[PDB]
C-alpha cells in the first residue's frame with residue numbers, strides 16, 4: 641500500500657522540498673501527536689490512489705474534510721461503508737436521482753467508484769482535527785492543492801471542473817475556460833442546496849461536455 645500515488649508523485653514532487661510543504665508536514669505531524677486528526681495518515685492522499693493523473697476527466701473541488709469519527713477517507717464528500725452518507729452527500733445523491741433518470745442510490749456513501757473513473761475528488765485542505773471544522777485551514781494545504789489544480793489546468797485538456805459553493809469557485813477562478821469546462825452552482829449542504837444546487841444538473845451536463853472533449857462519459861451509478 642502506497643502513501644502517495646506514483647503518477648501523481650512524479651508530477652507534484654517539485655512541491656515537496658518547498659519551505660511551505662516541509663512546514664506543513666511538521667504541523668500535521670505535531671497535531672497527530674496531541675490530537676486525533678482525520679483522515680488517518682494512510683488515507684490523506686486517497687485521491688492519488690484511485691486513478692492515474694493522466695486519466696482525470698472531472699474535478700470536484702471541496703474545502704475541509706469531514707471532521708467526525710470514521711467519515712473522512714481522502715476523497716471529498718465520500719464516506720466508506722458502513723458510515724451513513726452525511727446531509728451534503730444525500731443532497732448530491734438526490735440531485736443525481738432527478739438529473740439522471742437511471743441513477744440508482746448505492747445504499748452507501750463511498751465515492752471510490754467515481755474516483756476510479758477519473759473523477760478527482762479533491763479537498764483544498766487535506767487534514768482536520770477531530771470535531772473541529774477548519775482547524776487545519778491556512779497551514780499549507782491550500783498552496784499544495786492549488787499546485788494540483790494548476791498542474792491539471794496546464795497539462796491536460798477538456799476537463800470538467802465542478803465548483804460547488806463560493807470557496808470552490810474561488811479556488812477554480814484561474815482555470816483556463818478556453819481549454820477546460822467549468823460548471824458553477826451552490827454548495828450541496830442543506831443550508832445552501834436550494835440556492836442553486838438542486839436543479840443544477842451538473843452530472844448530465846458533465847457527460848455532454850465530456851463528449852465534446854471526445855471522452856467517454858462518467859457512469860455516475862458505478863459506485
Ligand SMILES: O=C(O)c1cccc(/C=N/OCCO/N=C/c2cc(=O)[nH]c(=O)[nH]2)c1
Nearest residue numbers: 702703704705716717805806807827829832
Ligand atoms: O462555499 C459556500 O458557498 C458554502 C455555502 C454553504 C455551505 C458550505 C459548506 N458547508 O460545509 C458543511 C457541509 O458538509 N461538508 C462536507 C464536506 C466534505 C468534504 O469532504 N469536503 C467538503 O468540502 N465538504 C459552503
